[PDB]
Design a protein around this ligand. Structure first.
Ligand SMILES: [Cl-]
Ligand code: NA
Lengths: 359, 359
């Protein structure tokens, strides 16, 4: 049906609007080009290769220390448990579509017996008013900048300041799900340190906008990080050797961190072209990062046929899937990376000329 | 004090009695030399690179299915929870020095709310009487072959059969901590499959006797493995890309699985040399695997000085550490691998003539 035809069409395209190209073994071998084969492996959380990377990212985030984790899934459940223990309160609060709530097979609930109170509604940004309306106290609030499931939306920076100030006054710990932190500094015109300064703890990824292989850093005060390392061993995350992910994380960080503004500008240019099409809009209308969602006023079956024809005729991958939203509405996500800049101008123009012609 | 002096002396040695050479980036480089840079990454537990490896190991172990985990610490906690749910019983039983009990910061207790009953006494092998004598129902019994903390001791295969048979009649799940399973097939003259046939589930490692970088396989019935995959995501172990560990595990498995008999022989010969020295004895007296413990009748500081001198004068690393057992008794562990055969005969002989002399 539509699903498989679109998938196949997308997979065959030489060019892609989204991403950083194929996730293949070459991503790792490229990262190892400048590394000495005699470089010693880290050993259960210790050693220059891991310690130097932790110290470096901690300094970039303006925190006392950091711990390298195999995943954000592990790291964030642990962060919330530490704050629950400090406050003797197993309730937390976050957006209904937090990664913890929907993408971790209920790990936070099942492994930590933490009860998440959902803030606002699934379709919009949470606000300070939602926090003020909580019917019981919480140990922490978790904020995801930007809110990926609603298209990568952000509150005004001044509103994040007000949330931070209120949490400080009420003794509520504030944790940053910064999976896509690097991608938002251009819009906010704030450094990573400035944004993270409003939070007690922060998690950042190296495989999202950075385009590395896998891995995460959790950062905060020394005492906090030391407790996180104990939990890391409990979770089976204190692997003997994490260098394959540390080296690749550091390589791709240095390769792509300077491109965040470029990806933001590119995403905005692309969104303008989508919005110019009849029956097509983006959310947000003007991207505030390298990502956005594209919505259509037609069913997924109908749009899939159009996208397949266009991908086949231009060689430019638009999307490998379409999410059904209502009877006659569907959508997909775009995250701009290195692939966008490789699309020849003619092919890119043709995609939209064709899109405008088919709908 | 001699602790760091010994450690530095050991790290400088070009040859070593134990292990498989330096744990450096080169280990990864070598494993990737014959992999196509275009080979596609696994994606959150799916894809040929991960699926083919899991299938390969499951067949070797004689089980329906297998799941690759980043760690045995995560894998085994999960295995025990699964059996605990099946039996509605959160009590388990194992040796007092099980890895779950002493090396995982109490993860089993803290994350899985399981109560472990300790079988027998810390200084010796648990027996079938210890199991039959429990007089309280448990969901599972865990067996570690060999028992590493007491020198790598093994019960007779015939006793394992009886333990398996008893647990089967009583409805008790039997789990194998097979971190060092590969190392014991020579002594038992039984295949991995024949050993695993006695157990409901099994965990095996790829970084110990195999000498890979990191990683584990958990294997058993397909329904058991599917539940394990749910828990894997909850733990933060379902990394987008595990190929760096999978490809290296497979590479070193192929390289060294056939040398297990050789390592066993070599260990026996090395233990004989240790035992022939006054003031020195191995546990077990005769190794039943590639490993054993070496005990001395002097203090860690006194032995540390001697080993430091011998290491500096011969270029052969004996031990990087000493574990104090009492004021005047200390010990270390030796696990024979590829390093041993690379020691020139002259140097090896000089090591023992010095040990004979100094003690
Ligand atoms: Cl703190
Ligand atoms: Na090189």
């Amino acid at each position: 049906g539509m699903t498989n035809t679109l998938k196949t069409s997308y997979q065959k395209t030489p060019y892609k609007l989204g991403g950083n190209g194929p996730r293949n073994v070459g991503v790792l071998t490229e990262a190892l080009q400048n590394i000495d084969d005699n470089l010693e492996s880290d050993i259960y959380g210790n050693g220059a290769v891991i310690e130097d990377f932790e110290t470096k990212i901690a300094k970039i985030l303006g925190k006392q220390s950091a711990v390298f984790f195999p995943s954000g899934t592990m790291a964030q459940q642990i962060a919330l448990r530490i704050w629950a223990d400090r406050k003797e309160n197993r309730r937390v609060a976050y957006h209904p579509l937090s990664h913890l709530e929907i993408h971790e097979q209920d790990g936070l609930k099942e492994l930590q017996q933490i009860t998440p109170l959902l803030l606002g509604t699934a379709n919009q940004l949470l606000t300070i008013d939602d926090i003020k309306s909580l019917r019981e106290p919480v140990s922490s609030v978790l904020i995801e900048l930007p809110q990926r499931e609603i298209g990568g939306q952000l509150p005004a920076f001044e509103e994040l300041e007000k949330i931070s100030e209120y949490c400080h006054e009420q003794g509520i710990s504030l944790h940053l799900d910064g999976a896509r932190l690097w991608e938002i500094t251009p819009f906010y015109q704030k450094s990573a340190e400035e944004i993270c300064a409003l939070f007690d703890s922060v998690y950042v990824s190296f495989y999202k906008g950075i385009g590395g292989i896998a891995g995460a850093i959790l950062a905060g005060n020394d005492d906090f990080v030391q407790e996180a390392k104990i939990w890391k061993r409990r979770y089976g995350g204190d692997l003997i050797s994490l260098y394959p992910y540390i080296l690749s994380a550091d390589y791709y960080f240095e390769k792509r961190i300077g491109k965040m503004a470029e990806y933001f500008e590119a995403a905005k240019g692309l969104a303008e072209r989508f919005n110019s099409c009849s029956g097509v809009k983006t959310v947000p209308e003007v991207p505030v990062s390298n990502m956005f969602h594209v919505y259509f006023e037609n069913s997924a079956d109908e749009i899939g046929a159009i996208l397949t024809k266009i991908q086949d005729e231009t060689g430019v991958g638009i999307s490998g899937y379409l999410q059904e939203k209502s009877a006659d509405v569907c959508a997909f996500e775009v995250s701009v990376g290195d692939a966008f800049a490789e699309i020849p101008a003619k092919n890119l123009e043709l995609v939209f000329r064709c899109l405008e012609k088919e709908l």
